[PDB]
Design a protein around this ligand. Structure first.
Ligand SMILES: CC(=O)N[C@@H]1[C@@H](O)[C@H](O[C@@H]2O[C@H](CO)[C@@H](O)[C@H](O)[C@H]2NC(C)=O)[C@@H](CO)O[C@H]1O
Ligand SMILES: CC(=O)N[C@@H]1[C@@H](O)[C@H](O)[C@@H](CO)O[C@H]1O
Length: 368
């Protein structure tokens, strides 16, 4: 088939969530991205020895899945939001790039992965409080990608297999200004656009995690008119990412605020009073939790914004507002993938939808 389905699996699923690689329906994906490997002393390293290469042994479980499902490709995701602070150094010199690339080859060979996903958040500007940047990141992301592609090509030749190289990219078009997407696109097998986290409880006002198109009714400070899926996809296409390599990110979680004023919009784009109820932490809901507990339940009502093409919940009693991925929005995005000839769908993350409501819709629309 023409489309990828790239599911993130979180290593920490193997703690209180009690969701292990054995729980994944491998018929519903083409790829698993394993979140995450860390960077230590310029090398890719095991993120969590309690569940990765030992203890609950998620890596053993992913190899078991590969043997049962020969179609499957498993990629190690390096870095992410919390663990990106090592990239700028790793990318900055030819010696550091070779050390990094060689450590990535060593990792996928030892643990049985089919390639490497680079989640550098983000070159030049942006990222967590611990994040490190330098202006040279714009060219060094290209050089690190080339070093990885060369190392994985050489290793694949030695091993009689093909290793993929991918990346997660910001939904914010600053990422495009701070990288050379026309160059790196040639070396990545595909590029997962994180077309989500456009709004969240970092804002004291409500908004949509993943609105499809711009809604001019949303006018809050610093919120770009490009903070939507179509704007992000069109920006990466314009920057030179080939359509067939551009994979559209979808969230399987939601965000919540409490004490949102109703205004004229049942709590949408309103000033709120902090995080709302969550599943495993305040303000963050699994789709499973929304579906079972909140979807037209417990005083929450579902609303549809036909400008943004996004659903939300509002509880008028508590003022709680939930942004989440409704099937009505996700169907529009799956049709858009097909109409644009895109590379498929990616989602964060597979444990957050236990009934596979969104998982199954994605697989039904994109897979054979
Ligand atoms: C449109 C935009 O710039 N949104 C920012 C968010 O991207 C950012 O959230 C972070 O987004 C990453 C994906 O690009 C996630 O990997 C990361 O987990 C997420 N960070 C947090 C703390 O949720 C938020 C918050 O930093 O800021 C927005 O401005
Ligand atoms: C709980 C958690 O860590 N989730 C974040 C999430 O904000 C984001 O959607 C994703 C980007 O792929 O990165 C994850 O690490």
């Amino acid at each position: 088939g023409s489309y990828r389905v790239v599911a993130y699996y979180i290593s920490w699923g193997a703690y209180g969530r009690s969701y292990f690689p054995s729980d994944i329906d491998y018929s519903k994906v083409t790829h698993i991205n394993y979140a995450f490997a860390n960077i230590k002393d310029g090398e890719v390293v095991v993120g969590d020895p309690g569940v990765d290469d030992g203890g609950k042994n998620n890596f053993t479980a992913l190899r078991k899945a590969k043997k049962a499902h020969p179609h499957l490709r498993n990629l190690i995701s390096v870095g992410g939001w919390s663990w990106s602070s090592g990239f700028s150094d790793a990318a900055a010199t030819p010696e550091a790039r070779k050390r990094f690339a060689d450590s990535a080859v060593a990792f996928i060979r030892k643990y049985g992965f089919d390639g490497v996903d680079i989640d550098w958040e983000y070159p030049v500007e942006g990222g967590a409080e611990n994040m490190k940047h330098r202006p040279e990141d714009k060219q060094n992301y290209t050089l690190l990608t080339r070093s990885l592609r060369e190392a994985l090509d050489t290793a694949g030749k030695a091993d009689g297999k093909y290793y993929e190289l991918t990346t997660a990219v910001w939904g914010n078009d600053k990422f495009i200004a701070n990288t050379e997407m026309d160059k790196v696109s040639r070396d990545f097998d595909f590029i997962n656009v994180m077309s989500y986290d456009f709004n969240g409880t970092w804002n004291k006002f409500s908004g949509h995690n993943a609105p499809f198109v711009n809604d001019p009714a949303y006018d809050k400070p610093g919120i770009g008119k490009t903070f939507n899926v179509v704007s992000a996809v069109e920006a990466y296409l314009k920057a030179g990412v080939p359509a067939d390599k551009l994979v559209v990110g979808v969230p399987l979680y939601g965000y919540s605020w409490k004490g949102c004023a109703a205004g004229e919009r049942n709590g949408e784009y309103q000033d709120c009073n902090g995080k709302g109820r969550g599943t495993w932490e305040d303000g963050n809901l699994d789709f499973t939790d929304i579906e079972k507990n909140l979807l037209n339940k417990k005083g929450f009502k579902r609303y549809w914004n036909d400008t943004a093409k996004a659903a939300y919940l509002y509880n008028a009693e508590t003022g709680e507002f939930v942004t989440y991925e409704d099937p009505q929005a996700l169907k529009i995005k799956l049709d858009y993938i097909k109409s644009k000839g895109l590379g498929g769908a990616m989602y964060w993350e597979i444990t957050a939808d236990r009934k596979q409501t969104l998982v199954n819709l994605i697989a039904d629309e994109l897979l054979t």
